[PDB]
Amino acid sequence: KAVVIDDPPLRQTPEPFDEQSAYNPQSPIAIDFGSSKLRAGFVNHATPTHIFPNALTKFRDRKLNKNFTFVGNDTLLDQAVRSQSRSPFDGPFVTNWNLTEEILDYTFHHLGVVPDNGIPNPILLTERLATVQSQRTNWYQILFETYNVPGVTFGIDSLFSFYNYNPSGNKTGLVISCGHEDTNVIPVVDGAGILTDAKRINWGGHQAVDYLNDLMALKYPYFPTKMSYLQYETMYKDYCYVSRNYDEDIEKILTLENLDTNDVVVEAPFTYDWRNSILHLFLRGPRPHDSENIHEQHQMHLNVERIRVPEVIFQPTMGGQDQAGICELSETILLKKFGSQPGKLSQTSIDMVNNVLITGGNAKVPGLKERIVKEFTGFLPTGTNITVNMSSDPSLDAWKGMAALARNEEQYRKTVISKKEYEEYGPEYIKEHKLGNTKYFE
Amino acid sequence: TRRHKSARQLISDENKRINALLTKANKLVPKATYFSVEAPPSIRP
């Protein structure tokens, strides 16, 4: 078998800008303020019009007033402008406000919306679960006394995806979302998320790429070239899958017959027997090491532990967080809450088992659904029908969620927080609608 | 001219707000905050 090489750089988009001047002054605007991808579009369209990496930069250019290529896909023309392109999103919260104003101004330019006072359209926001009150007050500020939006409402994007795949609005289910920086498990009864019993794991997919960076740097402390973080996402989203059973795989993952098909070798760009030695199998794979070759110094020999990176959402103790995995959280939800005991299931628990949805940008790792359904049938009673639902692309289905909430008129008008209600009630106010957040107390 | 607030102290001054509210109320079980949403540690080894 001839050993192949894998160059990881990602290409540059040559056409960044596309917008239309014709627009509807009464149709609302649906935007998903994702940690990884900004999504933008109208209401009448089924698919989101604009997909962006939610990042912006401040390019300093001499003799042209030092302010160019600010927001969006314009950073994707050159690697130099994409290098310092600062996504303002921290772990839980975005950080800078003028940056987010520039994101909103750029995307409002990209629907061709003309001024009419501030903005003549209602907005459709996505809000993270258990949001800090200061964030929601400053969100109220940056809509109302910044853009003059008449209609604001926001909710959990996983609940939006559940409403998208269950448009009836009164179904019972369990949604397991894995976002860029956060994963959570939320039970929905009668269309209403019982956030009181929802749980959260602080891993997401950003910490998975950070874990791969830390692993592959600790494996090779003397690597010649600096491995870029974008290339870490690139070779994470390509060679990482979830095993069916993690316990019996790691005792097989470094055998000689398994290394022929499991191991893929990546190549970084530039310009005493080894068979009995399992350190040679771990470091240099099923091929003998040529220490004089300039390729083998740059050979980024991954895939020996490609199972370890996506498994950590089931065992968060390998990631450093002392939290029970989504398997244990689903077990506690389906076997200890809503009147259900270990041994007999309530009807709500059976309906929740019969409708399980997984979504998010980190859900497109292969082997997730089979592992989820095998682990679910591990602890559930025999004969209980388990249905796990998946999307073709589970990252942008939340946008279809607020689109489906926008098509429904009477379900739109329950959740609308207006300017007048904000003015009489102050910025400390939460509409306890079912498709979103709730009060901190009773 | 709001300051460049980081993601660290926002959790702790929410926590300060929650203790201020519960000490001014008890002299009130929370429903869904950023801390009650947190997953408990696992019970199996």
Added chain:
Amino acid sequence: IYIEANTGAVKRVGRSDAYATEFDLETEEYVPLPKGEVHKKKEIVQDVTLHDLDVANARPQGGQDV
């Protein structure tokens, strides 16, 4: 564990590997979870003789069950 429904015999196979890391070293024998179903039923035939039933209930010192 192992339970026979008709006889009533209980046999402890041993601790599962889900609890194999409670301690680094212990006298427990860690056996895997059964891959099949919990409940398994089948038909068998018992071929005995009359002498077997004769010596089954003619013991000067009993205790063949234990």
